[PDB]
């Protein structure tokens, strides 16, 4: 099958599976996160409260608590079993754009239009660290180790920071413009990155040079943050584009699947943790589950 | 105050007394004098045991407190699915341009 | 020794060039045929599409 489920009122942004592979969550401009099943593809809770639009979901690695990143500074927290509020992580003085989580579900990183990175504990309700750069930040990724945090800004310079040192250790180079989504592999050994130059580049974690520049997935005037993912094997790379197409790569530098279906710009493509399924979201208010037999 | 003391409520406790004896069981009720009520109690005089049941201790008699164990023990949103389809667009290029 | 080796290798390699190419091409067309005319319901590679 394919399954193009409808439900949201307005532009949807982010849609992700549990780490387990038993649910979706989705939510964009609706101010409504809508949970789903995978295997009778039905809705669940209408997580209501966020007074800004959602920009990023992420399941806790317990598969119970959910975290948002509203446009009104809040980062909310939700008990996916019951569906009640837990907290309002009040901090930033602007619009949050990305979130990331660890193994230990306890630490979270967010990224504002205040040019401020901030690490959060799920127990304090306050910031543990505050890394002020200069130009409004956009994408962030934290490693599996719980050590390296990658920041993506407007300079095209993916900076790398550790939790012990807090020094500008390294800076990725050769990306001319804008970053819309970082993504660390299931190894902890390589990033993915969507630039506004349409060069969906991979980078190294440890020597730190490029690997493979992919090219063929356009951003334009919309200025949405488009996403990228690593497949459960780390064989395939799934980048969406404003051309209504989900450009899946071969990770060897070869375009295999280029499946259309959406009527509007695509945002955050994902992969299921085990069985080969693709979550693809788009302003359109629609979502697909593209499979491979 | 007594904010901490309410937190202990319904936990299995180990209570040492001035006599030396140590009572054990859950905590049902608590006081400003530290009168404790305890459920299914067992003294350990010392290789010894006794079964009492419900025990109400005074404040004079109690020395220390210590937890043995922890406390004992949105329907469907609008969304709907559909099947497949995957239409091809005649045009290429981005969404806003043309 | 050389005659028997040349027969077995030709038998192993050349056998799949005829029917396996047509059978897989038909199954590739059949999934696209079951997918209808103007809606790619079968998730084929870009080159084959």
UniProtKB/Swiss-Prot annotation, chain A:
InterPro entries the record matches: G-protein_beta_WD-40_rep (IPR020472), U5_snRNP_Component (IPR052234), WD40/YVTN_repeat-like_dom_sf (IPR015943), WD40_repeat_CS (IPR019775), WD40_repeat_dom_sf (IPR036322), WD40_rpt (IPR001680)
CDD domains per UniProt: WD40 (cd00200)
What superkingdom heads the lineage?
A: Eukaryota
Q: Which residues form the signal peptide?
A: none
Quote the subcellular location field of this record. Answer: Nucleus
Q: Which GO terms describe its biological process?
A: mRNA cis splicing, via spliceosome
Q: Is-annotated flag, keyword Hydrolase?
A: no
Keyword annotations: mRNA processing, mRNA splicing, Nucleus, Repeat, WD repeat
UniProt repeat feature WD, residue ranges? 7-45, 49-88, 91-130, 132-171, 174-209, 220-259, 261-292
For the keyword Nucleus, the answer is yes
Pfam families with a match to the protein in the record? WD40 (PF00400)
Query: Record's Gene Ontology CC terms?
Result: catalytic step 2 spliceosome; nucleus; post-mRNA release spliceosomal complex; spliceosomal complex; U5 snRNP
Quaternary structure note = Belongs to the 40S cdc5-associated complex (or cwf complex), a spliceosome sub-complex reminiscent of a late-stage spliceosome composed of the U2, U5 and U6 snRNAs and at least brr2, cdc5, cwf2/prp3, cwf3/syf1, cwf4/syf3, cwf5/ecm2, spp42/cwf6, cwf7/spf27, cwf8, cwf9, cwf10, cwf11, cwf12, prp45/cwf13, cwf14, cwf15, cwf16, cwf17, cwf18, cwf19, cwf20, cwf21, cwf22, cwf23, cwf24, cwf25, cwf26, cyp7/cwf27, cwf28, cwf29/ist3, lea1, msl1, prp5/cwf1, prp10, prp12/sap130, prp17, prp22, sap61, sap62, sap114, sap145, slu7, smb1, smd1, smd3, smf1, smg1 and syf2.
Q: What does this protein do?
A: Involved in mRNA splicing where it associates with cdc5 and the other cwf proteins as part of the spliceosome.
UniProt name for this protein: Pre-mRNA-splicing factor cwf17
Curated annotation (Swiss-Prot), chain B:
One GO biological-process annotation of the entry reads: mRNA 5'-splice site recognition
Localization recorded for this chain is: Nucleus; Cytoplasm
UniProt entry keywords in alphabetical sequence = Cytoplasm, mRNA processing, mRNA splicing, Nucleus, Ribonucleoprotein, RNA-binding, Spliceosome
Q: Which GO terms describe its cellular component?
A: catalytic step 2 spliceosome; cytoplasm; cytosol; nucleus; post-mRNA release spliceosomal complex; spliceosomal complex; U1 snRNP; U2 snRNP
Sm domain sequence ranges: 1-71
Chain positions covered by the region annotation Disordered:
74-86
Primary location: nucleus
Q: Name one GO molecular function term.
A: RNA binding
Q: Which proteins does it associate with, and in what oligomeric form?
A: Belongs to the 40S cdc5-associated complex (or cwf complex), a spliceosome sub-complex reminiscent of a late-stage spliceosome composed of the U2, U5 and U6 snRNAs and at least brr2, cdc5, cwf2/prp3, cwf3/syf1, cwf4/syf3, cwf5/ecm2, spp42/cwf6, cwf7/spf27, cwf8, cwf9, cwf10, cwf11, cwf12, prp45/cwf13, cwf14, cwf15, cwf16, cwf17, cwf18, cwf19, cwf20, cwf21, cwf22, cwf23, cwf24, cwf25, cwf26, cyp7/cwf27, cwf28, cwf29/ist3, lea1, msl1, prp5/cwf1, prp10, prp12/sap130, prp17, prp22, sap61, sap62, sap114, sap145, slu7, smb1, smd1, smd3, smf1, smg1 and syf2.
User: So what does this one do?
Assistant: Plays a role in pre-mRNA splicing as a core component of the spliceosomal U1, U2, U4 and U5 small nuclear ribonucleoproteins (snRNPs), the building blocks of the spliceosome.
**Family (UniProt):** Belongs to the snRNP SmB/SmN family.
- The protein in question is named Small nuclear ribonucleoprotein-associated protein B
Q: Which residues of the full protein are shown?
A: 2 to 118 of 147
UniProtKB/Swiss-Prot annotation, chain C:
Where it sits in the cell: the answer is: Nucleus
Q: List residues traversing the bilayer.
A: none
Biological role stated in the UniProt entry? Functions in the second step of pre-mRNA splicing. Involved in splicing intron which are longer than 200 nucleotides.
Q: Kindly state the subunit structure of this protein.
A: Belongs to the 40S cdc5-associated complex (or cwf complex), a spliceosome sub-complex reminiscent of a late-stage spliceosome composed of the U2, U5 and U6 snRNAs and at least brr2, cdc5, cwf2/prp3, cwf3/syf1, cwf4/syf3, cwf5/ecm2, spp42/cwf6, cwf7/spf27, cwf8, cwf9, cwf10, cwf11, cwf12, prp45/cwf13, cwf14, cwf15, cwf16, cwf17, cwf18, cwf19, cwf20, cwf21, cwf22, cwf23, cwf24, cwf25, cwf26, cyp7/cwf27, cwf28, cwf29/ist3, lea1, msl1, prp5/cwf1, prp10, prp12/sap130, prp17, prp22, sap61, sap62, sap114, sap145, slu7, smb1, smd1, smd3, smf1, smg1 and syf2.
**This protein's name:** Pre-mRNA-processing factor 17
**Record lineage:** Eukaryota, Fungi, Dikarya, Ascomycota, Taphrinomycotina
Span within the parent record:
14 to 62 of 558
